[PDB]
Symmetry: D2
Subunit: 268 residues, 4 copies
Amino acid sequence: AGLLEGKRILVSGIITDSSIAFHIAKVAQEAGAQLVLTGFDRLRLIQRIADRLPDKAPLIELDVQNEEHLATLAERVTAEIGEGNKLDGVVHSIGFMPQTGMGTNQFFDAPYEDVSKGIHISTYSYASLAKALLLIMNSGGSIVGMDFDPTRAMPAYNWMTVAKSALESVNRFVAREAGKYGVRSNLVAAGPIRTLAMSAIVGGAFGEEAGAQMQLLEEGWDQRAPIGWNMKDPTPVAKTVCALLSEWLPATTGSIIYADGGASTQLL
Amino acid sequence: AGLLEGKRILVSGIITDSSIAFHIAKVAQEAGAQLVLTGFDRLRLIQRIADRLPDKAPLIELDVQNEEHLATLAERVTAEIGEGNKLDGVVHSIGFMPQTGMGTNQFFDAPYEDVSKGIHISTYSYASLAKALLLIMNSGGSIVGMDFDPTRAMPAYNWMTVAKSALESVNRFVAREAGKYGVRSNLVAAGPIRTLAMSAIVGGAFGEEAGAQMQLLEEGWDQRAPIGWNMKDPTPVAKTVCALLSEWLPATTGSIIYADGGASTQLL
Amino acid sequence: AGLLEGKRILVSGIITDSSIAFHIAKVAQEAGAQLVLTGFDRLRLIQRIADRLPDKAPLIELDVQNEEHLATLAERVTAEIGEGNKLDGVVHSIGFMPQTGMGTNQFFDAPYEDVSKGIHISTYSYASLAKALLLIMNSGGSIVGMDFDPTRAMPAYNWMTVAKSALESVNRFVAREAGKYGVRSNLVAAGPIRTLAMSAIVGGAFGEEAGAQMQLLEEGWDQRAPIGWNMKDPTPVAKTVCALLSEWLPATTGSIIYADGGASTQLL
Amino acid sequence: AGLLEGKRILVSGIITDSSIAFHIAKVAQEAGAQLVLTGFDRLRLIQRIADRLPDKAPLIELDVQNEEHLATLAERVTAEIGEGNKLDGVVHSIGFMPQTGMGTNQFFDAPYEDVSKGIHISTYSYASLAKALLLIMNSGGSIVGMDFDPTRAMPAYNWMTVAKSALESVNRFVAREAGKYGVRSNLVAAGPIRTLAMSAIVGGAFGEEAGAQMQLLEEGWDQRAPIGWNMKDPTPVAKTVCALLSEWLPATTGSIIYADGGASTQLL
Ligand SMILES: CCCc1cc(C(=O)[C@H]2C=CN([C@@H]3O[C@H](COP(=O)(O)OP(=O)(O)OC[C@H]4O[C@@H](n5cnc6c(N)ncnc65)[C@H](O)[C@@H]4O)[C@@H](O)[C@H]3O)C=C2C(N)=O)ccn1
Ligand SMILES: CCCc1cc(C(=O)[C@H]2C=CN([C@@H]3O[C@H](COP(=O)(O)OP(=O)(O)OC[C@H]4O[C@@H](n5cnc6c(N)ncnc65)[C@H](O)[C@@H]4O)[C@@H](O)[C@H]3O)C=C2C(N)=O)ccn1
Ligand SMILES: CCCc1cc(C(=O)[C@H]2C=CN([C@@H]3O[C@H](COP(=O)(O)OP(=O)(O)OC[C@H]4O[C@@H](n5cnc6c(N)ncnc65)[C@H](O)[C@@H]4O)[C@@H](O)[C@H]3O)C=C2C(N)=O)ccn1
Ligand SMILES: CCCc1cc(C(=O)[C@H]2C=CN([C@@H]3O[C@H](COP(=O)(O)OP(=O)(O)OC[C@H]4O[C@@H](n5cnc6c(N)ncnc65)[C@H](O)[C@@H]4O)[C@@H](O)[C@H]3O)C=C2C(N)=O)ccn1
């Protein structure tokens, strides 16, 4: 009946029911989309979580650092959606920085191999997902990735912030490639969301000083946001992703849509 | 029934059938919205224009420089949508800069009285409109204004560019006020569109040389834009406005959505 | 002996010994510059304040809203520096917003005539100072204005923030005109400084809620600044202005240099 | 005696007499600085290069990918400037991206190992250099790196542009660490300069067509720049670096100074 009626959309990045991708998928399905899901390592976990979505969607394995997974992805998706059908959307909702690159650990103490792995997964992979799927996307199509505003430095997020600055740069280059297919590429810069990992972090999993810093950042965020911000509700974020997946933002690419309560637009 | 269904939306700024506001209004009605229009000094001319829209809408006089028009706006809007009803959306599609402030004269030769009038109409009035209408707006509502990207300077647009810089600033403050009513405020930064105001502005003039320069703007922007840009078609811009009038961008406020083909994201 | 040896520089905007222009002038003089000073209305005040600078400098009257003052400025300066000599620098250190446009008074309650006067003095005047003086500036010359970062909205500063967004846009256009003379135009975005007016404001001159808000902003500023920020010391700001007035930033124009402790580069 | 007098400054990144670092070093010595140089793998080649500088400087081996070189850097620098002496300045003038990541190959065809190496050398190493040298830097000291503006995407520069995006992010975090020693950290975003790395990069290639494209970059940037731009002359860039090494920008950190003729501030 709705926003994404008849669109075929791949959604990556579901790990638990609190993953922002889980909510992107739920809202996408409620809006009439047919999904193909992608998951990384804990596939039995992902299967039982994904089984709680509004409707069943095939689940495909994808480790973004695995060249063979990427090489086979388009065939695997085409098998899953039916030959002669293509994708109208791709959601990249994936990120990771080793523990040395976030929290307590001194900014200067992250080894490059840790940083490099974080940038592989968190940035480069946006270009490799695009490289793999563009050949099977329809004109009018939409690639969307998850971002957080890295224009300013901050405590705790450290090398993950750097990875996001790279990711934003990648998005602008992907947009040049995607545009040849009549496909758009954009990021959604969310406000902070209480995933399992972020709850653990605030709980002090990466040191308590880091937990305390993120707690302040979260409180300040809701204060700054002219419409407020609820870090326990990824729905407004999922809806924004769907807006980009729809045809109602046909002239936007290489860009960033801030789904953050308007916090980034206010000093205080 | 097709995005804005059940929504009551005020749309200002129709002067010709080429007006961006005209297309905003057309697309909005196609998508199920009940409109109230607002117009200038040629209420006859714009009434003949307005009747060529999909369905019928009250048409209302608003001189934004007329503090009387503004003091009675909420009064006249409520009479026309019916008591006990509020607005869900407000579109500011109003610009003006005297020719002295635009491609003719040297930048330095515009008298402040001319600039001050342009800033009044182009930027201040966004806050005036918000002041007048916020009190009869529903929670979850949306105010949108038309912008163009003034982050870098450029030939000809001169003091109108300055007025867009002021407008973007005015927008972030409006969002603080609007947020108290649960209402969002955003700008759409459009790529260039061949409205009658644009064709006339510049080209003519500066220079004199060209409507060729107009055509040249068209060809260079299409190239800059990863997904291309059709200056003759403001439908993509009108869709972007309608996305912001909808509930699909519920967490974005004080912000600017670029409906410019992605040109702003590319150096070339 | 030093940075600005043999340069002739006009400095506007001295009102008291706590004016940021007073410190710009002091540091400029200590660095070997010959000044011409400009003052607005309280010339006897300005005379006795200016008499405390390291060396004597002629003082000229300039009301930036007075067309006759601007029309005569270049002749008056040339009389003061000697015919056949030109300026190597111009410092615009001037700003003002009526009380309705800052503090307690609702953002929406500032009348346009108040706003317009603030933008006249705070923004447009940067272009009119440039229009008046460029004809008497040497190649390699430098125009510098005072800014504060208005990229985000904030409590209290209200319409003055809007005026600064306009001022930044003006600077980019002035740079296009100045470049024809081989002159640069740049702004320095300072951190908050305790002038008389800002002390009075924090003391509650514009309402106590506004005072309290600015006090927080000041405290947060020093916290965010990786090198700290001392709001009672305009010297680091004056030095930055002199850097721009020197030949050590020969390839920078239409731009903004942040003399703010690095605060704008940090979220927290 | 002419800006940097008495200052001890480390300068990395000399490979040819056309290197930006070479001109930084020349100008810095002209302005009274005692230099320590740092070099690659052609220490013979760069020693013959280095001797053509104004005065004599220790030359030191630094492979930034060599965690051993980095662990002994502060050791080897102190031996060479003398015990009980510290550095006042550090210049990072290092870039690398394999050709696969630059105008040759399609953006998507660069393998991550190549990108990861480029990011290592171009962006991560700014933090590595800071980690190694901060401990022997004086209060009031200054770290500067070379950047180019990566806010918008563009032909050819591809993953090197991504690496500059990462670098600007890395810079704001370095400034948080540097601030503890009373040390500033900033980037100079230069306009394009006809170094041997640039001429070769692209032009050749892509395309093949042209060193004409090189010349075209030159002519278009000069036009974009309000004060013009001479791609054959890196003196203006070297002066800007030296301004940041001086005490005349004492309140700026985590920031980017644009020494690009002001091109970045103009749409065209
Ligand atoms: C406070 C100042 C900075 C701040 C930070 C934030 C945020 O960090 C926000 C803003 C953006 N995000 C982004 O959403 C995305 C989804 O994460 P998110 O949903 O937040 O976390 P998770 O649920 O745990 O999902 C991470 C997924 O990743 C997958 N992953 C891991 N490695 C693999 C490889 N090798 N292959 C394929 N997939 C990979 C893993 O399996 C998970 O499914 C991600 O890009 C986040 O960075 C997540 C937010 C958060 N609060 O959880 C917003 C505003 N500001
Ligand atoms: C080339 C680089 C420069 C730059 C410029 C542009 C543009 O200028 C785009 C970007 C934004 N716009 C905006 O849309 C809006 C509508 O424009 P547009 O629809 O193009 O012009 P108009 O049709 O003539 O609409 C202006 C309206 O205003 C109203 N108005 C005027 N004064 C009075 C007052 N005193 N009383 C009440 N009404 C009045 C007037 O009556 C008109 O109805 C406006 O804000 C524009 O500035 C219109 C553009 C265009 N190409 O037509 C995009 C990208 N880059
Ligand atoms: C906290 C978030 C926002 C925030 C705000 C701030 C600031 O407001 C900063 C940053 C920039 N400034 C700017 O410096 C400039 C100097 O002011 P400043 O020196 O701060 O104030 P004053 O000493 O009182 O000087 C104002 C002058 O103006 C003159 N004036 C008044 N009308 C006339 C006309 N008609 N003609 C000619 N001259 C005019 C008047 O005579 C005074 O000499 C000014 O542009 C300020 O806006 C002054 C700061 C301050 N803290 O005093 C920085 C960082 N962030
Ligand atoms: C046209 C739009 C694109 C864009 C690009 C540009 C530029 O690329 C400008 C802007 C910035 N730069 C930067 O200066 C710096 C020096 O460049 P540049 O001096 O141009 O190149 P090089 O002379 O060849 O210097 C690179 C040095 O690095 C060193 N290096 C390399 N790897 C090794 C490791 N493993 N060991 C130790 N040393 C090594 C290498 O030995 C060289 O000494 C660098 O960061 C550049 O990216 C140099 C530019 C230029 N035109 O030459 C400006 C505006 N716009």
